[PDB]
Ligand binder design. Structure first.
Ligand SMILES: [Ca+2]
Lengths: 204, 99, 245, 148, 408, 147
């Protein structure tokens, strides 16, 4: 009723003479209903899952980014193209590309304790390989090029850099019941539920 | 296709095939006759040592921090109600009839 | 409904470059993209090609690299037109080829070249001429040994008899094929089937055998004769849905 | 040219309008694309070079698979990142990049053009035939008659 | 005064704001405390944080810049309608009644046949919207083009479509007059606003006492000007959270350089400013007369485009009073290093430019195989990807207590 | 066709005597009203439904209709909207417009019935909460204010 009202009111305001067909209205409602976002629990009953929003950079001990994939993260949309402002740019101008790349920075900057980054490494069908968001590439590329693991102190730029990348990237298993998640160490699962399966402890 | 390259195009005897194959044929290309076979095995074994266990956490639930609002009262149904319209006249509810 | 399918996408782009209002558009594009590389080109079709010459053909200050291989145009059923590739071939005059075949063994490379060299116009369309290729040096040492000595890069297994129906040549061929597979597979557990590069060797595992097939049925026929020898298999081109399982 | 194509030498291939490259089975179609891509970004080549050096948002590359563009895109952000480093170091001890280095005239500059291209990759004009289409459509919606 | 506080972290900014509120009592007659905010989250975070270090939060208005700038217009200039008559939506309807007429004018030939070949107003209403939208934008970035097109003039250097937009806009304007509606936009009303404020050097007409601008990393040039003019009668604390303590923006003339080599005060102490005397302005810093060729950190280097601009616009102000509040970040974590590298505007990357550099590796920072801040994760599918996180969250909750989950 | 009934309804409700002494919404200019105020009260030390029951009982004759403590332990924050807060020259108020139920006629809106419904929906809880809010808020705004 609100959206529907506001829509019509806005027309009446501009004093629209002609008659209007339902589609015109139904479509506007649809759109309006698709841009309305519900985020009323944004900070009570904890662990907030949401999208990266512009102009909402808050400090958190933990910050994790998921599906930061090429083609998925810096989010896109080309200006209308008959947008004069977009071809002759100026310092104030905004664009999703910039907003979005700047949000990935604000993330890095606001995490106070741990930054968690995740992406999908390959579709589970054609088993072809995926790729991370260039923004994530840049982040591990600059880490690698400025750190070295205690062991490797005398080996090589390129050599030490790879190891640091390989050390922070953690390939995960296709199924949650693969044994590797139940060995000891880096993220053994807290999910006993799959233990039996993992240990082939079943009865045919 | 394979037939056309082997028999250079012209059709052949069932034996004219055999002779074309032999024709192009040394170490790189070779032929044998369909030697059928049987022996249900793929005689392969296994071995396995499932030495596993799962991390159990020793922290505990304890306390819960929340943002409430005189909803500590008003039982649900308002699930997603207070969410979609923050200021809906939540205190009302129902139908109306022959009045 | 306010919708767009895939065929429409590049269809409306063709009609757009043909409308009178088609030059403003061709120019627009040509400016954004001065040079364009089209890959897998052997699989185009009238609509695409037309989009592409209308924008790039005979147009200075731009370059149009069309790369692909007519010998691998197998998407007839989808819409891919080998003829619109052959035409394009008539219209552009600079031809080029990659001469060396990294990736494979010399005997393999030799027997394929031999096979497709027999007659002229192997692909029987003069416009799809077949020119041999050299094998790479980094691969001159590859060779496959089985229960003794080096096996040849290409072996024809040949049924007996005079006639032979499609049904037989299958039952019999699937049979034969599964057999030769465990024969490889178990001779490999024992170390006598080796994939070798000069003096390096590794036994053949199941992850190295592969059966190419033309259809869902053939695949089964294979999976069956294979399953009959206890040899587990997977049909990677399987399309069934989890909903009728 | 003419009858029986020339054995394409990537580095000396004239990047000026209309070229048909036949890549037989197992021949390097992918390594070649890459090379060409680098050549174009740094306007390398010679009389066989392209008039000017182009940008990531100007090298149109169309592929057929969704998986193809992805791979292709992944492969190129890498050759850039490398040809670039091998440009700060002014030395490369691995094939392609060396011959390319030989062709370069100001390693220092390449390394900056490249660094920009690397940063741009999240927008490389690498699309599928369909992707390329809805894009040209949507931009020039008035000629096409498209809805926004 | 239009005070500008720069800080490494929202906390300190909130803090200062927390302070300013406690100090000048603020009046008390039901007057809202005011805070520009450009997202409900910020408004959420702010109400909560504030109800804590005060025991309660109750009035605070959370206007969006645009919405505020126009509220003041209605306060400072004489008779301005609440709600302009050129708001994006209504302009959409007006343009839909015009465009049909306007067609067949050679001027609009393009829109002419775009609008024919078929419709039931579908194309018509979409065009009227995207058009309404651009205008809405131009009215904020490019306001001058409108005063220009309104009269019949074109602007040199624009692409075509200026060809129909300029005429079109003119049409809308007159039309909106014929309907008898408040001619007043945002572009025909901002200069006037600045003037009647920039002069009238007497006192603040009837506006609020103080005004905060929290968690907003970009404002449109004009919006800033109007803020400045406004901050000459009103107290305006604009809290910008900045990722670097030095200036990492671009520079204009070699003359403007030393006009920036100023100094910002601490909100509470002495003074500070970008390092290395001159060398800095020289070195590379402002090489390409354009940008800061170096921009120390290569991350801030590629991602902060939106920030460099806003940073650059804030320091071109005059009535401004920028000041530092950056907190430090000791380099003990992989996370902490990186953030420090960025705060300091330093680069630690090693390209290995000469065998000397390239051969040893102990020049980089020592990792620590046991460090888990900044971790990467590759998975096979959303599902998996989320299961995997559910574990890792569990583990990190397990690890250090103090980690309640609102903190994630 | 509801305009006749409604406009006649609005005024009636505007021109009613809330607290006998002056009162009547109609005497409230803008400067003396604040509509829909929104408060946040931190509430540390879990708030146990029981422990709140005891004192609610002691001080309120209404909440003496004791079924309460229907919720469970909560530390956290407390959101809330106040329909209207207005002042009558020294003296701030809490107003809550309640469109409510179709209980036939008049017979249902008398000092008991209301007091009745009041307990049905334990709205009494709302008062106390809301005023603890207004209290805190005023105390924070009015330098040297007394409840
Ligand atoms: Ca109410």
């Amino acid at each position: 009723e609100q959206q529907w009202q506001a829509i019509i009111a806005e027309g009446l305001g501009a004093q629209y003479g002609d008659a209007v067909p339902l589609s015109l209205l139904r479509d506007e409602l649809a759109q309006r209903l698709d841009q309305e976002r519900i985020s009323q629990r944004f900070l009570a009953g904890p662990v907030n899952i949401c999208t990266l929003m512009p102009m909402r950079s808050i400090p958190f001990k933990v910050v994790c980014l998921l599906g930061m994939n090429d083609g998925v993260y810096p989010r896109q949309l080309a200006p209308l193209g008959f947008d004069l402002m977009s071809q002759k740019p100026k310092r104030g101008d905004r664009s999703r590309r910039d907003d979005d790349r700047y949000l990935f920075l604000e993330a890095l900057i606001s995490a106070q304790q741990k930054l968690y980054i995740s992406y999908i490494g390959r579709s589970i069908q054609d088993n072809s390989e995926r790729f991370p968001s260039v923004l994530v590439q840049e982040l591990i590329d600059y880490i690698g090029q400025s750190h070295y693991l205690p062991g490797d102190e005398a080996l090589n730029c390129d050599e030490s850099e790879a190891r640091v990348k390989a050390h922070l990237t953690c390939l995960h298993t296709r199924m949650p019941f693969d044994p590797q998640n139940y060995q000891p160490g880096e993220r053994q699962s807290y999910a006993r539920e799959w233990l039996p399966a993992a240990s082939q402890a079943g009865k045919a | 296709a394979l037939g056309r390259l082997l028999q250079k195009g012209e059709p052949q005897d069932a034996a004219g095939l055999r002779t074309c194959i032999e024709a192009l044929c040394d170490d790189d290309i070779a032929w044998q006759t369909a030697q059928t076979g049987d022996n249900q095995p793929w005689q392969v074994n296994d071995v396995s040592t499932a030495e596993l266990n799962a991390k159990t956490l020793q922290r505990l639930p304890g306390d819960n921090w929340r943002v409430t609002s005189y909803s500590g009262l008003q039982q649900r149904g308002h699930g997603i109600a207070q969410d979609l319209m923050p200021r809906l006249d939540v205190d009302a509810a129902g139908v109306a009839s022959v009045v | 409904r306010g919708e767009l399918g895939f065929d429409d996408m590049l269809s409306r782009l063709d009609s757009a470059l043909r409308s009178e209002s088609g030059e403003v558009l061709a120019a627009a594009i040509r400016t954004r993209f001065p040079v364009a590389m089209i890959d897998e080109f052997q699989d185009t079709d009238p609509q695409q090609y037309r989009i592409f010459r209308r924008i790039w053909h005979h147009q200075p200050e731009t370059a149009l690299l069309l790369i692909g291989d007519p010998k691998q145009a197998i998407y007839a059923f989808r819409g891919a037109d080998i003829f619109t590739y052959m035409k394009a071939r008539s219209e552009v005059h600079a031809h080029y080829t990659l001469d060396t075949n990294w990736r494979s063994a010399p005997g393999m490379v030799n027997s394929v070249n031999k096979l497709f060299s027999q007659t002229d116009d192997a692909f029987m369309f003069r416009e799809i001429p077949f020119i041999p290729v050299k094998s790479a040096g980094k691969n001159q040492a590859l060779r496959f040994v089985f229960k003794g000595e080096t096996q040849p890069a290409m072996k024809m297994w040949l049924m007996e008899g005079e006639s032979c129906g499609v049904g037989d040549y299958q039952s019999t061929m699937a049979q034969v094929c599964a057999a030769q597979i465990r024969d490889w597979l178990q001779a490999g557990q024992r170390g006598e089937a080796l994939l070798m590069n000069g003096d390096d060797a590794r036994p053949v595992r199941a992850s190295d055998i592969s059966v190419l097939v033309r259809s869902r049925q053939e695949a089964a026929q294979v999976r069956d004769a294979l399953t009959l020898l206890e040899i587990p298999s997977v049909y990677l081109s399987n399309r069934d849905s989890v909903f009728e399982t | 040219m003419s009858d029986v194509a020339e054995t394409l030498d990537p580095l000396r291939l004239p990047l000026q309008g209309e070229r048909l490259i036949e890549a037989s089975a197992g021949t390097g179609k992918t390594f070649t694309i890459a090379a060409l891509y680098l050549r174009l970004l740094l306007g390398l080549g010679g009389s066989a070079a392209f008039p000017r050096p182009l940008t990531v948002e100007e090298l149109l590359v169309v592929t057929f698979t969704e998986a193809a563009t992805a791979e292709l895109r992944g492969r190129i952000r890498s050759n850039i990142h490398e040809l670039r480093i091998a440009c700060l170091r002014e030395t490369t001890d691995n094939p392609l990049y060396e011959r390319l280095l030989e062709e370069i005239d100001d390693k220092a500059q390449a390394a900056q053009w490249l660094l920009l291209a690397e940063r741009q990759m999240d927008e490389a004009a690498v699309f599928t035939i369909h992707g390329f289409c809805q894009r040209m459509l949507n931009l020039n919606a008035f000629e096409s008659g498209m809805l926004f | 005064m239009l005070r500008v506080y720069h800080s490494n972290r929202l906390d300190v900014l909130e803090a200062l704001m927390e302070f300013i509120v406690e100090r000048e009592r603020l009046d008390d007659p039901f007057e809202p405390e005011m805070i520009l905010v450009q997202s409900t989250g910020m408004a959420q975070w702010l109400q909560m944080t504030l109800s804590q270090k005060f025991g309660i939060a109750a009035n605070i208005d959370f206007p969006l810049p645009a919405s505020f700038i126009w509220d003041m217009f209605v306060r400072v200039l004489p008779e301005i309608p609440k709600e302009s008559a050129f708001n994006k939506q209504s302009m959409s309807w007006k343009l839909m009644t015009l465009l049909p007429q306007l067609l067949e004018r050679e001027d609009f030939t393009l829109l002419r046949h775009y609008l024919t070949d078929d419709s039931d107003k579908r194309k018509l209403f979409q065009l009227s919207s995207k058009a309404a939208d651009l205008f809405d934008q131009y009215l904020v970035y490019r306001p001058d083009w409108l005063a220009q097109w309104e009269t019949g003039h074109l602007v040199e250097g624009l692409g075509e479509a200026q060809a129909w937009q300029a005429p079109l806009w003119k049409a809308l304007v007159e039309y909106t007059h014929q309907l008898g509606q408040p001619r007043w936009h945002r572009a025909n009303l901002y200069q006037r606003f600045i003037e009647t404020l920039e002069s009238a050097t007497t006192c603040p007409p009837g506006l609020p006492s103080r005004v905060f601008i929290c968690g907003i990393s970009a404002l449109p040039p004009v919006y800033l000007q109007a803020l400045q003019a406004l901050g000459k009668h009103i107290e305006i604390h604009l809290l910008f959270t900045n990722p670097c303590r030095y200036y990492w923006g671009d520079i204009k003339d070699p003359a403007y350089l030393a006009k920036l080599l100023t100094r910002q005060r601490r909100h509470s102490f002495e003074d500070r400013e970008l390092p290395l005397f001159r060398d800095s302005e020289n070195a590379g810093q402002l090489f390409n007369s354009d940008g800061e060729q170096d921009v120390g950190n290569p991350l801030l280097a590629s991602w902060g485009k939106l920030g460099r601009d806003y940073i650059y616009l804030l320091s071109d102000l005059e009535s401004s009073q920028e000041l530092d509040a950056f907190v430090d970040v000791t380099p003990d974590n992989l996370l902490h290093n990186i953030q420090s590298d960025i705060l300091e505007l330093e680069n630690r990357a090693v390209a290995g430019v000469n065998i000397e550099e390239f051969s040893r590796s102990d020049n980089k920072r020592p990792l620590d195989p046991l460090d888990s801040s900044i971790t990467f994760h590759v998975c096979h599918s959303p599902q998996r990807e989320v299961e995997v996180l559910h574990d890792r969250l569990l583990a990190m909750l397990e690890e250090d207590p103090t980690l309640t989950p609102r903190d994630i | 066709q509801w305009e006749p009934v409604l406009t006649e309804w609005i005024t009636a409700v505007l021109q009613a005597p809330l607290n006998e002494t002056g009162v009547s919404l109609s005497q409230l200019s803008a400067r003396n009203k604040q509509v829909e105020m929104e408060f946040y009260l931190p509430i540390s030390e879990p708030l146990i439904a029981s422990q709140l029951d005891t004192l609610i009982r002691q001080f309120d004759p209404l909440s003496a209709g004791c079924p309460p403590l229907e919720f469970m332990q909560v530390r956290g924050m407390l959101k809330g909207f106040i329909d209207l807060v207005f002042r009558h020259e020294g003296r701030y108020y809490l107003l809550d417009y309640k469109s409510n139920w179709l209980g036939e006629d008049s017979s249902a809106y008398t000092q008991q019935a209301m007091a009745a419904a009041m307990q049905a929906h334990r709205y009494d809880l709302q008062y106390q909460l809301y005023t603890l809010a207004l209290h805190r808020y005023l105390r924070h705004r009015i330098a040297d204010y007394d409840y």
